[PDB]
Design an enzyme around this catalytic site. Structure first.
Site, PDB file in Angstrom:
ATOM      1  N   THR A  23       0.863  -1.115  -0.069  1.00  9.82           N
ATOM      2  CA  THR A  23      -0.145  -0.007   0.196  1.00  9.82           C
ATOM      3  C   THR A  23       0.834   1.308   0.108  1.00  9.82           C
ATOM      4  OG1 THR A  23      -0.233   0.033   2.466  1.00  9.82           O
ATOM      5  CG2 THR A  23      -1.883  -1.010   1.186  1.00  9.82           C
ATOM      6  N   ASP A  81       5.775 -14.380   4.947  1.00  7.20           N
ATOM      7  CA  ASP A  81       5.961 -12.931   5.337  1.00  7.20           C
ATOM      8  C   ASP A  81       7.252 -12.831   5.949  1.00  7.20           C
ATOM      9  OD1 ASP A  81       3.691 -11.845   3.658  1.00  7.20           O
ATOM     10  OD2 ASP A  81       2.550 -11.607   5.604  1.00  7.20           O
TER      11      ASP A  81
END
Lengths: 517, 479, 517, 516
Positions: free
Chosen positions: D84, D384
């Site tokens: 983002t 991740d």
């Protein structure tokens, strides 16, 4: 709600277009009248059908038309100064100033700042002015060559006029009037007479300063050593220029008292006039028969019905003085005239002088069928006398008919070779506007403009500085052999006035119009 | 091409407005032309075939079309005949210029080309004319009689013709002076009597009566143009009136051109007043502080002759002054009798005036126009450049006059002008259209002729109008 | 109902706009890509979203975009010939041809006949060619100066590409490959390799004709004196590119029979190949492991999957024959090779050759991150090698970067004064189009084109024939010092192909369209 | 002016279409970011704050909006974090370029100016970064735990951190290889048990069974990959099997068992004790009659293996693919020390093959869990975590979070804009002012004043160091290092580099042309 109720202000975008469109419309209106083949135009006032008329004169069109645009109003005022001062080139100033603005509008669409364009035209103006100075050819000696140039300039000024057909006889009238002057270029010395009857070829000329006016009833036809004295006052009756004053008359005897009081007042005025010791008297107001007999008994010639132009001209030709007040004697200067004779031209009594102090003056007597022909004959002749008088002061002459306009455009082009970046494009449009004058002349003559104008570029490129346009045969030839030339002061004045007129329009980016009253 | 700016739109507007006028009057040409009906704004309806009268009632608002109206007026002033023919010729020329402007030919080239065709056209009509003698009064009588036969009154033309001939020959030296002033001959018409009674007076005859002045006769006259206190003012008013009479009496003026009725009778001064300015101009050429004897005229015997049919007239003879003037007295039953009698005199004087300036006679019935169009076609072949098509358009525009006369005669307009062209090629101008017999016939035997000035002034004045219209670039409305 | 059923025809003035706008629209499209700073463009095919891409190459843009009007098809076809024959200046031809028609469209509104404009461009073309001959400087000696100029040609050709970063290393690779040629401009002798891995600066240069693809699985790294024989047939499996053929199998005994005979048919072909007694074999098809082991056991190298581009290049390098039929010995001509090596570059096996005929051949290896970089680098290298071929044939070179375009425009301007009237205006529009090329280059770089182009016109007006534009520093400098030059054969071809393309479109006043089939 | 050709209408269309994408997604930035309601065309709705998931459901037809979707995907491949953040920066730069284009500055000058600012931006982040040692596992453990704290599962991030560290140290040489390939690490998740139980397997682990083979354990096994389907005779060429009467029925039945038996004998001659068959949907991979014959030879039978595991089995234990039984031999076979099926309490039945004893570097992490949704989020947590560890390997450094590097970057570029000259003064300054959108967004989601918070941070970064920032947990400005908020340097460097290349690419597009 910035400007409302009559107040209008055009923004930078709109005031830009409005300034040029208003000015270009004025130049495009009179451009058809340029050259001897130029078109005519009809002028008719709204609401009155008696204003109908047809004239090819570019100066007359601009005077009668109204202008509501302040940007176009400046161009009109610069045209009237050209006609009132120099007298020639009124159309040339308007057309050349319009072509500079038409090309300047296309340069603004290229995002060229107006101040840069102005810097380019100033340098190109000096280069175009030096081109005429190098090509100017005067004559110190050989008055025959100097007189022949005057005939070519007079025949050129009379072109595209009502007198253009008969101008061959008129060139001898205008040149001889200026040739006999041989001195200061004052035009008041050359009187103009307009008489009805006869054709245009019947116009005469007098070198003794012939007067257009008739004097008295019974006057002596010859006088020796007549002293000229001008005066301004009513010589007719009482109550001159006095309104509101009446006289009570109860019977016929009261009228006889007025007749005696009139003769008593005129007698006192004649006495003061005779105390000057003059053989001739001049006044603007009409002279009554009783003081006329008092003047004839003493030998004094009575001159009456003089105008404002008479007092100014009669003073310098005869060497006299205005002398509005004749009350105090021998305080004024008196004129000098050898002989005053009566000459009848056109079934009218006219006054002819002789041997006056500075007798280089003269008079031209026009002959026409009606007054409208005589009025246009004087305007065409007076404009010719202005440039001929200027030619005496400066004898430098240049070749017209597209010769001088194309030569200046060539010098600006060579200047565009050495120049910074943005000034190169600005001076190129300045040279294109100079080539528009010989282009419009060919269009009004029906000849092909693109063929004739483009050959002049190749002609003046390598040698041949004297080439130009020939309207008679429709080809290119020597302007010196064909005898087409104009004065140098006319070209310099048209070139500078057109550059200063187009410079003001560029300096105005906005037009603020207040609320009309 | 582009042609963003279109000044020719006003050119086409000037041609369309000018052609609309010539197309209207075209049908009224010739004795056989159709009559037209003009209704006045008040509702009055009139019918007349005269072209000069209709053009005045059209009320033309268009500037270029008004020039044709003024063109017809200039034709009546000089020649006095052929008013309708000039408008038709000027209309066909502008119509021929439409096809030329579409080809890209410049107007100044067109304008200068018509001038060369005009100078050549005058020589053609002159060489083919018939020279006549002005001193001969037999030709003047026959030329005027046959010309007035096509006019309204054909019966009395034999009477009024010698009255006009003897008047002009008296005021103009035969075969000497080339200028004739029509204002030097005054025509006076009165109700009563008949046209058979006419009197040519070498002096002047006016309409005024000397009432209430009872002198009525002045020989060798010099004529010129110019309670106690309540009773005392009446004596002072007589003093002011007599004062201005005393100054007149010192000069010797016995006739004045304008309580005082009695003072003028004591001085034996004939009273002539209420005179029109145009009538004064006739007297001006014939014979208070600024009033002197030098401006006075002269006369022999003045008097007022009152006849039955001529009314009250002032007969003054023996003016004894430099000049040549006469006067014609006209009588007739009604007002329309004397009206057409005087109108026939004006037409008679104009034809005679044309013969004095230019001595010649040419045939009528469309003959001068076809012979003109025939020679200009061959003359256009010798020219080079744009003048080739411009002269041919000027020649082909001359075909409208003969085609109109043939159309009003009932014949075929196309076949008539075609047959006549070959008759003028082999023969002479004598061939033409005869409207009386309704067919092609020799005009020379028909005794139909017209003076040369009518045809020459028709081409000269119309060409100057066409050239003036083509040179107009646009119109500007001032204020 | 004169034109219907799909067949239409455009009128004079309408087809005048249809022909010009159709060509100008193609011109205005590629103007953003002209120059090293040229802007990018997006190409998206209809119906395929995966076709989204971006390229600044003007030649690629014109090939993918379809053309509707027939007038624009001529301009596109002339641009395609420019890319195939020469390989440089594809955008320069389209942009220059569009500027000629854009100026010619304004001349028709001036009532200038199209045939007159054509006569003007032909005479101006000769003056443009003579100006290049005097400016062109070749090298008859000092090969070091000639080799230094070759590096300048590579830097100009590879500009405005994705290789600009490592371009400094590619200038040596392009020149070295051409110097080894010393012969005709055929580029089939120089192989091109596209492999992933490494950076652009890691691109090598091999003079031993390194092949594109690997061979087999387990192959000998080096073989001594290998005989080259090309053959076209399947060595892998039976029924290669054969559909519809079947083999009947009755039971499990015949299931293996067709399997063993499949290897027998291959082994029988192996026996016929060894009849020539050669050391190496090359095939267009693949090679199965069983005949591959039969090759390695006898000392024969197995080369497979040689495309049509390979078999034609292997014939001239090895001096062999295609040899489609190996069935019988001494029916074909074999090749000659000394050493065949194996070099691993970019995670692949590459086949190196040594000691072969035509030693002038070489190969350039390309290394990049993705296939898109390799594809763009191939056309950039292929165009660079083709231009360098003409520089060896014709050593004459000219200075690019706005220098050569302004010199030709200066000669046309001087000729415009020596030409008559109607041909003078047509030449000025031809010289103006030449000044549009350096103008667009300056616009794509974000600089001021009005100043830079005007200074060059003033610089080349008097002396300084080597002046040009510097895109790096954003100013005007000497092109000889900065080392910027272009080939003479390229500029001469762009000049002629642009004039002939604009001559055809200008001559056609009407377009006749028929019904689509 | 005139502007016959107007490329600006395409530039304004590209900026407006690109900014519209960043305007929506910016609200999801940060742990406190707002959620969204995504309604699919079929009527189904969902609630997620993940920016990468929303962009895949946007379905943008505009070309400029599609390049931002590809830009967010390239960020997850390199760093794996800050998806983002890249989209917001790419949208803020184009918004600032709009003010520059109105001033008349050409994009090529703007494009060249951002490259010089990008060069200085990397140097500023490098000096502020704190170098750390990759060989130290203490800091590396807290780096993965902190990054996974903001993720879905914050509870199990403690035990999963060292499991990912030990897996990388085995397949990657410490302080040697600059690049790490994550494709050598696979995750096997089964239902039952808990995530706290983790087993790192040096070999390969499969979720299939030994069915129907009843061996279940083999020592010193030989393994190979057979892509050929073992079943009744079938040929790609067109054939037919004619069955008329009972005589032909047995003729076909006996040959089906004989053809399979002939193929099994080829495997027995090679000595392969474990058969791994690739799953094929065209024809039956393994039949019932083959199950009976493979049991007599005592060979482990395994099937239903995806092609993704075939590429992993090849590199792990050293096997090779075999497309036909005739090509099957000892040269294509691998080997292993122990190959069997390990069945624990709640981990299900797993295939454990260990002790390959060949060249290579491979590891397999096996994590248990109760719910199928719990084991999937555990895979994302480990994935991740491996991305964060990979960032420290390529670039060794640590920087503070919470918009801390954005203020230091925007503050220092302003001083560099004063020293430059020309158009680079306004272009670099616009690039600096666009860096304040990241801290202004984090302060908005934290319940503070976006305008006042950014102003105070610029003063604290001028006098102080990078320590100043925004703490979203306590809702106020505090020390970022003391709050245990840290991010690797590669995430911030790749965010500026990839976003700049996209902004420069958009400014170079004058017009779009549709072809066919």
């Amino acid at each position: 709600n910035i400007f409302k109720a009559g107040a209008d202000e055009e923004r930078a975008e709109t005031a830009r277009l409005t300034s040029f469109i208003g000015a270009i419309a004025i130049g495009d209106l009179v451009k058809s009248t340029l050259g001897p083949k130029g078109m005519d135009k009809i002028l008719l006032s709204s609401g009155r059908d008696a204003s109908l008329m047809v004239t090819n004169d570019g100066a007359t069109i601009l005077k009668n038309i109204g202008v509501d645009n302040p940007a176009a109003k400046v161009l009109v005022d610069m045209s009237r100064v050209q006609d009132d001062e120099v007298g020639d080139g009124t159309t040339s100033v308007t057309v050349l100033a319009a072509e500079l603005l038409r090309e300047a509008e296309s340069l603004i669409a290229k995002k060229i700042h107006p101040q840069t364009i102005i810097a380019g035209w100033r340098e190109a103006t000096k280069a175009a002015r030096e081109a005429l100075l190098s090509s100017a050819v005067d004559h110190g000696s050989d008055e025959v060559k100097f007189r022949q140039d005057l005939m070519n300039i007079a025949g050129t000024t009379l072109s595209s006029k009502l007198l253009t057909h008969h101008k061959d006889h008129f060139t001898k009238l205008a040149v001889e009037a200026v040739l006999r002057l041989k001195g200061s270029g004052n035009l008041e010395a050359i009187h103009i007479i307009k008489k009805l009857g006869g054709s245009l070829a019947d116009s005469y000329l007098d070198e003794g300063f012939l007067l257009d006016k008739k004097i008295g009833v019974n006057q002596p036809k010859r006088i020796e050593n007549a002293k000229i004295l001008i005066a301004n006052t009513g010589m007719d009756t009482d109550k001159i220029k006095i309104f509101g004053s009446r006289v009570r008359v109860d019977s016929t005897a009261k009228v006889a008292e007025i007749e005696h009081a009139e003769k008593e007042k005129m007698k006192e005025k004649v006495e003061r006039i005779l105390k000057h010791g003059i053989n001739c008297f001049i006044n603007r107001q009409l002279i009554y028969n009783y003081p006329e007999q008092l003047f004839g008994a003493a030998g004094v010639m009575a001159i009456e019905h003089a105008d404002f132009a008479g007092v100014e001209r009669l003073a310098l030709v005869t060497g006299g003085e205005i002398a509005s007040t004749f009350d105090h004697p021998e305080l004024v200067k008196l004129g000098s005239c050898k002989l005053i004779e009566e000459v009848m031209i056109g079934e009218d009594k006219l006054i002819h002088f002789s041997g006056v102090a500075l007798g280089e003056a003269c008079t031209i007597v026009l002959r026409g069928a009606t007054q409208q022909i005589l009025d246009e004959a004087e305007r065409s002749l007076h404009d010719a006398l202005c440039v001929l008088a200027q030619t005496v002061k400066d004898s430098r002459t240049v070749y017209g008919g597209g010769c001088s306009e194309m030569l200046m455009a060539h010098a600006v082009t060579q200047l565009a070779n050495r120049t910074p970046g943005k000034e190169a494009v600005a001076m190129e449009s300045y040279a294109k506007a100079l080539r528009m004058l010989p282009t419009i002349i060919a269009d009004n003559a029906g000849y092909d403009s693109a063929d004739l104008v483009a050959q002049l570029r190749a002609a003046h490129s390598e040698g041949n500085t004297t080439a130009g346009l020939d309207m008679r045969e429709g080809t290119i030839g020597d302007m010196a052999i064909l005898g087409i030339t104009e004065s140098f002061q006319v070209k310099r004045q048209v070139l500078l006035s057109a550059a200063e007129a187009a410079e003001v329009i560029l300096r105005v980016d906005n037009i603020i119009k207040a609320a009309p009253r | 091409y582009q042609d963003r700016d279109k000044p020719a739109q006003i050119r086409f507007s000037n041609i369309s407005a000018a052609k609309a006028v010539a197309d209207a009057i075209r049908t009224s040409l010739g004795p056989k032309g159709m009559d037209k009906m003009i209704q006045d704004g008040k509702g009055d309806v009139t019918i007349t075939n005269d072209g000069a009268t209709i053009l005045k009632q059209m009320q033309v608002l268009h500037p270029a079309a008004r020039m044709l109206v003024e063109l017809s007026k200039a034709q009546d002033i000089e020649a006095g005949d052929g008013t309708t023919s000039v408008v038709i010729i000027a209309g066909s020329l502008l119509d021929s210029c439409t096809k030329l402007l579409q080809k890209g030919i410049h107007p100044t080239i067109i304008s200068e080309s018509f001038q060369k065709a005009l100078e050549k056209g005058i020589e053609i009509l002159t060489d083919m004319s018939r020279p006549v003698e002005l001193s001969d009064r037999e030709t003047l009588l026959n030329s005027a009689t046959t010309s007035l036969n096509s006019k309204v009154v054909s019966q009395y033309s034999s009477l009024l013709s010698p009255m006009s001939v003897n008047a002009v020959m008296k005021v103009i030296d035969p075969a000497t002076a080339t200028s004739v002033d029509l204002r030097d001959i005054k025509i006076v018409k009165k109700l009563g009597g008949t046209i058979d009674d006419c009197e040519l007076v070498e002096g002047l005859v006016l309409t005024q009566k000397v009432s209430n002045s009872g002198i009525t006769r002045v020989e060798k006259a010099k004529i010129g143009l110019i309670y106690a206190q309540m009773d005392r003012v009446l004596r002072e008013e007589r003093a002011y009136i007599l004062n201005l009479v005393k100054q007149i009496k010192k000069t010797g003026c016995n006739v004045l051109l304008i309580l005082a009725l009695h003072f003028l009778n004591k001085m034996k001064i004939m009273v002539i007043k209420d005179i029109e300015r145009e009538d004064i101009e006739f007297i001006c050429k014939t014979i208070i502080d600024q009033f002197t004897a030098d401006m006075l005229g002269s006369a022999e015997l003045a008097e007022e002759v009152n006849l039955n049919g001529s009314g009250k007239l002032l007969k003054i003879t023996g003016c004894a002054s430099p000049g040549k003037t006469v006067t014609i007295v006209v009588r007739g039953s009604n007002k329309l009798v004397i009206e057409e009698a005087e109108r026939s005199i004006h037409d008679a004087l104009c034809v005679i005036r044309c013969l004095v300036k230019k001595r010649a006679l040419i045939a009528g019935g469309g003959a001068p126009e076809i012979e003109l169009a025939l020679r200009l076609t061959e003359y256009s072949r010798t020219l080079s450049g744009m003048e080739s098509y411009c002269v041919r358009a000027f020649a082909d525009a001359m075909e409208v006059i003969p085609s109109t006369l043939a159309e009003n005669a009932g014949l075929n307009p196309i076949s008539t002008v075609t047959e006549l062209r070959n008759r003028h090629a082999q023969g002479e101008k004598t061939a033409g259209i005869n409207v009386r017999k309704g067919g092609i016939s020799n005009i020379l035997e028909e005794l139909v002729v017209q003076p040369l000035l009518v045809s020459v002034s028709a081409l000269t004045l119309a060409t100057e109008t066409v050239r003036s219209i083509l040179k107009i670039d646009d119109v500007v409305n001032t204020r």
